[PDB]
């Protein structure tokens, strides 16, 4: 059994590149096949960002592609997410999920200035 | 106009009629024997109706077979397409899954078929209509109408496909229990309750090595049954439909364009009473003139009749001695235009009998008593 | 969109709820259902055809027909007052799409 915990910088200024981190504890990140990112703006609904089922290549949301980069490394044993050129609409709670069955408790990111 | 037919023998018609066509036959049936008195025959045959008992098979689907290859202790790996209603999965792994599922029609298995036609026959003053089938000839005293059978693209066990809106194809081969992808009927939703997935008899050829990255290669059929049918559409018989009647487990309709023909046989009996049943443009008047002889058993009697012919120069017929719509005797005679004297010999009757001179259902206004035989 | 829900659904205690989701891919894929309570992470309720994770009550059921999928809650209770999101694969087969969500209020 493992427990996921995602962490971020909290508050970032516009146009600045965002970088999330989902740490897997109690086991390996390779124990589960497929990992996914998904965010929801406050007062709004869920939005799937991207997923990595494949050691070969990740799936990304068309609207968010290019801006978003997702990665899986075994050295630090954590799920990686990077959003470039962030606007005031990217401010949301970012969730980490494996097999979309188990979820982390999320981390709020606010984009203000 | 309309032609005449001297009934020297039974008339017989034997012919093939287009299902979407009506048929009319009209003829004056004129007296065999040297008389031109005539009975009108008028036959009307209506378009063919098609009725089929069926089992509803549910909807047929189109779809696209996709193959995804994944590599990373495979067990338990959940892949993002395990929520696909139809998928098959076989270090590396291989995954087939069906996408772009779209319904293309509702399918029905034929149990029994029946072709009907409505038939109306007028023979003289008789007119009768009946809906006939191969197992039920139209029967009357003088005319029989039979359907010998039909040449049809439909058969028992065939499967009918209706495109939306209800287009249509005939299939002679439909998958039932085991359906493999590419078969007619391969992807079905019967009852709408669930989803019946096709099988994939093909083999996975795992190409494995370094740097080049592996590829899963499925060698079975990649083309859906629906696509295969559209790609060879001329191999299949289409039909069009009109005047539908979908009663859930029965479908009755009329085929609107060519397609089926049936064989019609019409037989008209030679045994016809052209008197009473027939017509003549000749007008005959009858009157009794006198009588001799006795009623009841013995010598019998002879009735003398005055008979007038108009509108023709001669007419061969029979003049009868009758009373109260019972006949007791008749004389065959060739009448000439104007007045004629005809003696008719008869037997029978009783003391209360008034014997009249008669022709068909017409009798003179005057009748006579014969004398007693004692 | 391409995965639409009804915004809000209100139910009296004990009654039966039916939350529907409609989309073109829903006749190619089984929907996933997620329950979200305020200030908490989403929780899986239903996947595939009525398959459901442990810890999930018997009163949650899966349903599909045509281009729709429904999550049924028979004999609703107060703790079910939450958000419900419909989830499925895209028609392209490369994306994962969510629905608009449905705010269920129990009375
Ligand atoms: C009805 O179908 C026939 C073939 O079965 C086709 O030739 C005909 O064009 C169709 N009718 C119309 C009005 O297109």
Q: Which of B87, B55, B61, B54 is nearest to B186 (CA)?
A: B61
Give the Cα separation of B128 and B137 in Å (integer).
13
Q: Which of B115, B118, B136, B124 is nearest to B268 (CA)?
A: B124
Look-up of token digits 């958000």: C83
Domain assignment of residue C106, given as a range: 1-107
Residue B340 Cβ < 6 Å to ligand 1: no
Which letter does DSSP use for residue C51 in this model? B
Percent composition of chain C: helix, strand, coil (DSSP 3-state, to 5):
5, 50, 45
Give the Cα separation of C88 and C17 in Å (integer).
21
Answer yes or no: do B176 and B64 share one domain.
yes
User: How far, CA to CA in Å, does A86 sit from each of A59, A101, A110, A112, C11?
Assistant: 20, 28, 10, 10, 40
Residue B257 Cβ < 6 Å to ligand 1: yes
Under 8 Å between Cβ of A12 and A111: yes
| Tally of structural domains, chain C | 1
Under 8 Å between Cβ of B214 and B196: no
CATH of the domain at A98: 2.60.40.10
Distance of CA A103 to the CA centre of its chain: 11
Q: Which of B127, B126, B131 is nearest to B147 (CA)?
A: B131
List of chains touching C (3+ CB pairs within 8 A): A, B
Residue B247: CB partners within 8 Å, gap ≥ 6?
Answer: none
Host H or E run for residue A94: strand A92-98
Q: Which atom of ligand 1 is nearest to the CA of B256?
A: 1
Which letter does DSSP use for residue C74 in this model? S
Answer yes or no: do B358 and B227 share one domain.
no
Compute, in degrees rounded to 10, the torsion defined by CA atoms B238, B241, B245, B247: 20
- What DSSP string runs through A47-88? EEEEEE--SS--EE-TTTTTTEEEEEETTTTEEEEEE-S--T
Least CB-CB distance to C48: which of B83, B98, B194? B83
Q: What is the resolution of this structure in A?
A: 3.0
Give the Cα separation of C23 and C43 in Å (integer).
22
Under 8 Å between Cβ of A93 and A49: no
Q: Which token pair is B335? A: 């009448």
Under 8 Å between Cβ of C105 and C81: yes
Look-up of token digits 């504890």: A25
**First CA to last CA across chain A, in angstroms?**
41
HEC assignment per residue over chain B: CCCEEECCCCEEEEEEEECCCCEEEEEEEECCCCCCCEEEEEEEECCCEEEEEEEEEEEEEEEEEEEEEEECCCCCCCCCCCCECCEEECCEEEEEEEEEEEEEEEEEEEEEEEEEEEEEEEECCEEEEEEEECCECEECCCEEEEEEEEECCCCCCCEEEEECCCCCEEECCCCCCCCECCCCCCCEEHHHCCCECCECCCCEEEECCCCCCCEEEECCCCCCHHHHHHHCHHHCEECCCEEEEECCCEEEEECCCCCCEEEEEEEECCCCCHHHHCECCCEEEEEEEEEEEECCCCCCEEEEEEEEEEEEEEEEEEEEEEECCEEEEEEEEEEEEEEEEEEEEECCCCCCCCEEEEECCEEEEEEECCECCC
Q: Within a domain: residue B220?
A: yes
| Tally of structural domains, chain B | 3
The rounded Å distance from CA B259 to ligand 1 centre is: 11
Whether residue B284 is preceded by a cis peptide bond, meaning omega within 30 degrees of 0, is: no
Answer yes or no: do B213 and B299 share one domain.
no
User: Which of B64, B66, B83 to mutate: most C Cβ within 10 Å?
Assistant: B83
Answer yes or no: do B116 and B197 share one domain.
no
SS3 category, C27: helix
**Structure-determination approach:** X-ray
Look-up of token digits 């007052």: C81
Give the Cα separation of A28 and A74 in Å (integer).
8
**First CA to last CA across chain C, in angstroms?**
30
CB contact under 8 A, B83 and C89: yes
**First CA to last CA across chain B, in angstroms?**
60
Strand pairing partners for A29?
none
Question: Chains A, B: CB contacts under 8 A, how many?
Answer: 24
Measured between beta carbons, which residues in chain C are less than 8 angstroms from residue B63? 28
The residue length of chain B stands at 374
Measured between beta carbons, which residues in chain B are less than 8 angstroms from residue A59? 80
Answer yes or no: do B335 and B215 share one domain.
no
Q: Which token pair is A113? A: 């200035």
The rounded Å distance from CA B252 to ligand 1 centre is: 19
Answer yes or no: do B76 and B138 share one domain.
no
C91 vs B: CB within 8 A: yes
Give the Cα separation of C21 and B287 in Å (integer).
96
Give the Cα separation of B318 and B330 in Å (integer).
6
Q: How deeply is C17 buried, as exposed, middle or buried, from its count of CB atoms within 10 A (0-12, 13-18, 19+)?
A: buried
Under 8 Å between Cβ of B155 and B112: no
Host H or E run for residue A35: strand A35-40
Under 8 Å between Cβ of A82 and A74: no
Residue C56: CB partners within 8 Å, gap ≥ 6?
Answer: C44, C45
Furthest CA-CA distance within chain B = 137
Domain assignment of residue B306, given as a range: 281-368
Give the Cα separation of B198 and B225 in Å (integer).
10
């Amino acid at each position: 059994q493992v427990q996921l915990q995602e962490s971020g910088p909290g508050l970032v200024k516009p146009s600045e590149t965002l970088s999330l981190t989902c740490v897997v504890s109690g086991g390996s990140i390779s124990s589960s096949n497929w990992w996914s990112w998904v965010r929801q703006p406050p007062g709004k609904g869920l939005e799937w960002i991207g997923e990595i089922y494949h050691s070969g290549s990740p799936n990304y949301n068309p609207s968010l592609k290019s801006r978003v980069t997702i990665s899986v490394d075994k050295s630090k044993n954590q799920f990686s997410l990077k959003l470039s050129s962030v606007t005031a609409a990217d401010t949301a709670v970012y969730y980490c999920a494996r097999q979309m069955r188990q979820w982390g408790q999320g981390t709020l990111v606010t984009v203000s200035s | 106009g309309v032609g005449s037919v001297p009934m020297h023998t039974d008339l017989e018609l034997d012919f093939s009629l287009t299902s979407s066509s009506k048929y009319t036959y009209r003829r004056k049936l004129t007296n065999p024997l040297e008389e031109a008195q005539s009975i009108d025959l008028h036959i009307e045959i209506e378009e063919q109706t098609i009725g089929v008992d069926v089992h509803a098979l549910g909807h047929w689907f189109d779809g696209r077979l996709n193959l995804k290859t994944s590599f990373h202790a495979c067990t338990k790996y959940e892949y993002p397409w395990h929520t696909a209603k139809c998928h098959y999965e076989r270090c590396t792994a291989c995954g087939l899954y069906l996408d772009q599922l779209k319904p293309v029609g509702s399918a029905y298995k034929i149990i029994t078929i029946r072709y009907s036609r409505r038939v109306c026959v007028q023979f003289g003053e008789e007119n009768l209509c009946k809906i006939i089938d191969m197992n039920d000839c139209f029967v009357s005293r003088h005319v029989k109408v039979c359907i010998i059978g039909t040449v049809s693209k439909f058969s028992q066990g065939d499967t009918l496909l209706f495109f939306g809106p209800l287009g249509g194809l005939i299939f002679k081969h439909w998958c039932t229990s085991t359906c493999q992808f590419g078969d007619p009927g391969d992807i079905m939703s019967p009852r709408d309750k669930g989803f019946l997935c096709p099988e994939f008899p093909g083999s996975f050829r795992k190409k494995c090595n370094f740097a080049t990255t592996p590829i899963c290669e499925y060698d079975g059929n990649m083309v859906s049954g629906y696509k295969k049918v559209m790609a060879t559409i001329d191999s299949f018989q289409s039909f069009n439909t009109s005047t539908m009647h979908f009663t859930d487990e029965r479908i009755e309709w009329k085929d609107p364009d060519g397609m089926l023909r049936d064989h019609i046989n019409i037989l008209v009996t030679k045994d016809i009473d052209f008197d009473n049943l027939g017509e003549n443009p000749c007008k005959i008047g009858l009157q009794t003139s006198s009588i001799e002889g006795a009623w009841g058993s013995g010598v019998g009697f002879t009735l003398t009749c005055l008979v007038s012919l108009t509108e023709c120069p001669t007419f061969l017929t029979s003049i009868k001695a009758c009373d109260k719509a019972i006949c007791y005797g008749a004389e065959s005679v060739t009448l000439t235009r104007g007045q004629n004297t005809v003696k008719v010999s008869g037997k029978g009757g009783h003391s209360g009998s008034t014997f009249r001179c008669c022709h068909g259902e017409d009798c003179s206004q005057i009748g006579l008593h014969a004398a007693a035989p004692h």
